[PDB]
Design a protein around this ligand. Structure first.
Ligand SMILES: [Cu+2]
Ligand SMILES: [Cu+2]
Lengths: 283, 278
């Protein structure tokens, strides 16, 4: 409970500077790429084979899978600069803004802006604009530049609200059988956003568009980690509020989705990361 | 230097029943599938992006990546039955047989035989025959049927030889830049089989055919591990009789991690320290 992950809106210019710097270094080093691949690889690991469920989404392990993912990313960042921690994007507040693209999270000194429709929605502002930042497709090959198209779809014209975050936090069960895209009264499936979707998480990916718009390639965009830090935070909060509640399923769910099963592509299990304070950080 | 990997031809009837038994349990548990995914996932991680190399093939990390891979698979086996270790298929000796498909490895109590051509070459005998063993396509989805087609191609109608092996063993340099398909005087590249390819490792895959014919789906066939065990052996010897140490593409150096894991080549340079010998 010593490294503290802050709200992006509360970062000092030098904090934003250092975060960007380090991710750039993590990118130059070839480490960042490992994270894009792990994500694409997990999505292709169906539990069980022939099912929608994959090691990282559309099932119970969604939350702990990405919590582990962020933990690893933060440690790698820390290896570069121990002063740096993963901030979180509180999109539910930006959603209150008239035009969310006005959020400081999209300023030229942090995440960069919306895509340029003159250049096929290629983002040309900020540290990650094309020419400074390389991207790779689902196949693992060069794709040619980050892309964004903020709220351009009929399905997700808006970012998720506070009420949405507050309504989800009211769910009494972590997840419910069958442990998938259809699970009812499920805080997990609710946060993932499949209920009358896209909501919350799925809705954020949809809103941003570009590579964030497709799960397998989402990580090419640094904001991805900031978005998942927010999701991880909302889950930490649920855990605090429901202390008699715990992870599910505990057993008899498909391999890779139970409390003590390994989470592909790793050996780490949901139990291993159930307690986030134990992981060394807080919000 | 205590778990001992035996020649598949030196295995007893019970040791083979146990091995098979153990493999079917892994598949059963859902653990086996992790392996097919990891190998597949690796082929899509290029070092660097835009190049011909991937985390596990066509580059220096080819050998270290599969040794680690095999080390893990074996451990998962041990977990099920601590008596079971990973056997190896000495294909250079079967290359001498008039008809290698008669090799005991292909018996109905161990790996089953070459696919039945009338059934689209789907393996119809052995423990892993269609209906007894599920395979997964490249998309990670279900494909139904283990296939094999022994020596069916023009470029690979025969298994590598003792000489081919002996000649590989002669190579002095572990690997040479550019650290890829085109490396000359490279033990890594010779054994992988790109020199005058398809040879040795590359040749075995081409020979067996079926899922083994294509790298991404290769692990659906239990022999994959048996075959790679022999490769680790051939390398084990070379090491008795690494490069690039630095400056080669990230993911290939002596101290870089081997995607999708954190383990580095160094970590597995000395196989004995890993707890096994051949
Ligand atoms: Cu994800
Ligand atoms: Cu391979």
């Amino acid at each position: 409970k010593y490294r503290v992950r802050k709200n992006v809106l509360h970062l000092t210019d030098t904090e934003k500077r250092d975060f960007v710097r380090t991710v750039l270094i993590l990118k130059e080093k070839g480490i960042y790429d490992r994270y894009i691949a792990w994500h694409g690889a997990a999505g292709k690991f169906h539990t069980p084979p022939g099912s929608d469920r994959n090691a990282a989404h559309m099932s119970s392990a969604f939350l702990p899978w990405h919590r582990e993912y962020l933990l690893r990313f933060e440690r790698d960042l820390q290896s570069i600069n121990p002063e740096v921690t993963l901030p979180y994007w509180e999109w539910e507040t930006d959603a209150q803004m008239q035009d969310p693209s006005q959020s400081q999270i999209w300023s030229a000194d942090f995440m960069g802006g919306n895509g340029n429709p003159i250049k096929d929605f290629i983002v040309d502002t900020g540290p990650f604009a094309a020419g400074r930042w390389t991207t790779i497709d689902e196949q693992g090959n060069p794709s040619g530049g980050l892309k964004r198209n903020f709220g351009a779809t009929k399905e997700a014209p808006t970012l998720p609200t506070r009420d949405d975050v507050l309504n989800a936090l009211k769910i009494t069960q972590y997840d419910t059988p069958p442990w998938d895209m259809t699970s009812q009264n499920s805080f997990r499936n609710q946060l993932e956003g499949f209920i009358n979707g896209p909501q919350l998480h799925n809705r954020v990916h949809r809103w941003v568009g570009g590579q964030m718009g497709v799960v397998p390639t989402a990580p090419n965009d640094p904001v991805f980690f900031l978005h998942h830090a927010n999701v991880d935070r909302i889950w930490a909060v649920w855990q605090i509020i429901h202390r008699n509640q715990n992870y599910q399923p505990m057993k008899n769910g498909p391999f890779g989705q139970n409390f003590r099963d390994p989470m592909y592509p790793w050996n780490t299990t949901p139990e291993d990361v159930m307690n986030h304070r134990k992981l060394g950080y807080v919000y």
